[PDB]
Design a protein around this ligand. Structure first.
Ligand SMILES: [Mg+2]
Lengths: 515, 351, 164
């Protein structure tokens, strides 16, 4: 009756909505090792900064008994909060309301949230935890997903979009994640697949568990779909906060500056990383960490295509992206999977104004029929495109091998690198020095009384005389051959200059990158 | 590719829009058979590794197979005839067909049996100028069809499910094939004409483990990003994520037409009805009678094209014999379509 | 059943929608000195050039007996035609269907047509003939109007807008 009576009523309406699917569904969620949609936001956002919208939204479709139930928030919390003082748009699906199924209004809430993020120039964090389409709502469910995908696409390379998979993510639900920039998957509780095991069994006869089909580790290791693996919902929330700390709010901002390391020095022990034997590998991250601020490296997709390493670091407090061959895995070759991993990361970096720091130690591409037949040409070409297209600063350090097409692809001067440095261990050649001597000296070797001895001498003389870094440096392809202990100083100084780098690109709606 | 094309050479072709390969003489690979044999042990000929058929059929790298150099030269001339010189020009107008009529035998292409397929090119060719269709990548991912054609003399690109191959499912390879083509059409200002008849995504452990998620998303991204006119005709099935992907209204189509044979549903009618009526089927004194009653009823009442038309998701349900006339008129209106996109250096399409 | 059976069913559904509010409501329109929503279009546009869209749209609101009735086109014809060889977007309210009252779906059709006229850069012609808000649809009808007003404002000085 009175205003205060209406306030008491309002509070009751709200408390009922905040129950979600009810106490028993919440107990079940917690027994599954999962937090609630609201408990997740609580960890993710700065304390008391979350403002919910559309809390009172109710579904409208009446089909199949839907007119006889209330569905709180229609299964999704949407709003805006702060993370480390910066505004962020967030949604959090509630699995306790009809399996977190996407209805029409649920989807419209998420669409409204993405529209808003784009308009305000702020990042979007989606926490998914959903059985998929609410099939009782029919084509409206599909209409919903479709509109979400369109919003994700429009936002792509305008605001950073991060997805956490913290439960099921089945059917068309899987594509919004795919359209976002980074996917964090929670170990054991997260699963993602278009088609489930029972349909697969009915159609192909393949028998597989959900975890083996689409678990967090599968998508991190096999499919290349996910970028991080968190143990926990707690760990997934802290991961998202750390990741965002590297990124701008939108594509019209420089990235944030945080806790500058102002020292210029590279430790002496950087000389002890590369083995004396050029056939032996090492962990390239031991080089990365002796060059970046505080030794801090935030690795992206660490379980997938481990022959290439990518992640975020800082130089003098400023975000950089790292791309590096990993000689300890597949001798640091390029292939289909590494090409995909690196190319997409580089396009993200360029879209959000982050410099690209490349470390090169690669003999070429992985030989094999499956690589050829699986499209290494078109996949490999993505990396070349991605670097060529980038207008952000590109600094490349060649540590050891750089042979053939892979020399080119790994942020070479010819694709627009602003500075190329070579260690004295660098070995730049048009192809592997053995294969090159076999071609150049085909006549001398075949003519010889001892072709293997003759071949062996020519390979050595070729490595010495043609593959040393001073040939590329004599042409200006390598800007400087440097002492490895000078690496950090060079990178800092170059990056200072390159803060004001302006590069144009021809007008186009967009390009035609190979897919 | 009119000969060998080895090592780093291959990447320039990969960075261009279309690759024609000449049958017996063209070969393309990053690494040759000797190096593969020395490293992996695999014994393979140059033809089998990187011949023109291999790249047209398996690898997805090439778009045309010419029998010889003569044919490849003519093929190139014919492909250019559909294209503008640059992205600031409208595509060229050639040999206009201004008739409006779609032939009566368009009604005889779809089988009576919904479980049977047909060749979607028999529909395409009864709608486009003079029946002329210039197919792109015909040997690769044959469950989807793409190519060039003309409506009133003006270039259109075609994307069509092929129900005669793998039931017209979408998969990794078909997504890649169509998505890149769409992005090309968009960049060079060519309208996109889509024909829909698909039950969904190809199920399989290898599809999932192969990244069907990121690959399939490329097609959603491509249609969503496109600002050229998008006209879509639903011929028959359009289930689930696949309905959304195939030029749906929700990704910004300008016009969506449905034949009366169209069957639009959130998932397969069988699978949907099994879930929704799970209880009633298990409480009936004969489940398979009630389950079959309910499935037919679900199809009739919920999957017909009028539900989506009632929401405006389908602009019109039409007689199949009106298809050419609707497309022609939609495209006359859409010649002046202007649509803006957010300012960005570029997007971050899944790769 | 077959494709041709489904075409015949489609024709039944279209003839029914084309009744508007029925022969008696149509006769009353004519007695009042007024043409129907479709007769007006037939005079306005170059012959045979009109393409209707959203003919099969149906209202969603169930309030106050709305769940028991069918409302052809939800009371408005929308589409594109030609006038002297030039494309024009047209809407024409049908007074025979609940006094031409503006439901949510009716509003959504007009909004869609305005969006489209703007994007394609063609004039809009609105033929109004309506008692006002469909009262039974509540606030959704006001949402409907507001979105139309928003579309008129964005289109103002971009494409010409004529109302009858
Ligand atoms: Mg691929």
């Amino acid at each position: 009756m009175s205003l205060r009576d209406k306030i008491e009523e309002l509070k009751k309406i709200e408390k009922e909505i905040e129950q979600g699917g009810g106490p028993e569904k919440v107990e079940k969620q917690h027994r599954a090792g999962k937090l609630t949609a609201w408990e997740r936001l609580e960890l993710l956002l700065d304390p008391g900064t979350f403002v919910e919208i559309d809390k009172f939204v109710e579904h409208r479709n009446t089909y199949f008994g839907l007119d006889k139930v209330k569905l709180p928030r229609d299964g999704v919390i949407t709003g805006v909060g702060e993370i480390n003082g910066r505004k962020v748009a967030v949604f959090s699906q509630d699995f306790t309301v009809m399996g977190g199924s996407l209805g029409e209004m649920h989807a419209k809430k998420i669409v409204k949230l993405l529209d808003l993020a784009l308009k305000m120039g702020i990042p979007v964090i989606g926490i998914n935890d959903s059985g998929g389409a609410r099939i009782q709502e029919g084509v409206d469910a599909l209409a919903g997903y479709g509109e979400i995908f369109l919003r994700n696409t429009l936002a792509s390379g305008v605001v950073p979009q991060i997805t956490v998979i913290a439960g099921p993510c089945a059917g068309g639900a899987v594509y919004s994640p795919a359209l976002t920039d980074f996917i964090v998957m929670v170990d054991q509780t997260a699963r993602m697949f278009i088609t489930g095991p029972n349909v697969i069994k009915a159609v192909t006869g393949e028998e597989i568990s959900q975890e083996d089909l689409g678990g967090a580790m599968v998508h991190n290791q096999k499919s290349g779909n996910a970028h991080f693996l968190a143990d926990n919902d707690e760990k997934a929330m802290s991961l998202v906060r750390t990741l965002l700390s590297y990124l701008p709010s939108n594509n019209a901002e420089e990235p944030p500056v945080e806790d500058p390391d102002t020292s210029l020095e590279t430790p002496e022990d950087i000389l002890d990383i590369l083995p004396d034997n050029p056939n032996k590998g090492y962990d390239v991250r031991d080089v990365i960490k002796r060059v970046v601020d505080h030794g801090e490296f935030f690795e992206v997709q660490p379980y997938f295509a481990k022959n290439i390493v990518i992640g975020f670091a800082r130089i003098q407090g400023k975000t950089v992206g790292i791309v590096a061959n990993q000689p300890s895995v597949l001798a640091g070759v390029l292939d289909i999977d590494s090409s995909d991993k690196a190319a997409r990361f580089i396009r993200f970096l360029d879209a959000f104004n982050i410099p690209i720091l490349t470390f090169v130690d690669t003999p070429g591409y992985l030989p094999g029929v499956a690589q050829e037949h699986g499209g290494i040409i078109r996949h490999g070409a993505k990396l070349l495109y991605a670097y060529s297209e980038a207008t952000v600063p590109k600094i490349t350090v060649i540590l050891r091998k750089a042979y053939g097409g892979a020399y080119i692809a790994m942020g070479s001067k010819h694709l627009g690198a602003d500075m190329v440095l070579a260690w004295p261990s660098a070995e730049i050649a048009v192809m592997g020095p053995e294969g090159a001597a076999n071609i150049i000296f085909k006549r001398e070797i075949e003519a010889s009384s001892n072709p293997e001895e003759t071949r062996r001498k020519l390979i050595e003389e070729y490595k010495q005389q043609f593959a040393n870094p001073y040939i590329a440096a004599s042409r200006g392809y390598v800007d400087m051959v440097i002492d490895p202990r000078e690496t950090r100083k060079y990178i800092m100084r170059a990056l200072e200059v390159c803060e004001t780098k302006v590069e144009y690109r021809p007008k186009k709606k967009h390009g035609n990158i190979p897919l």
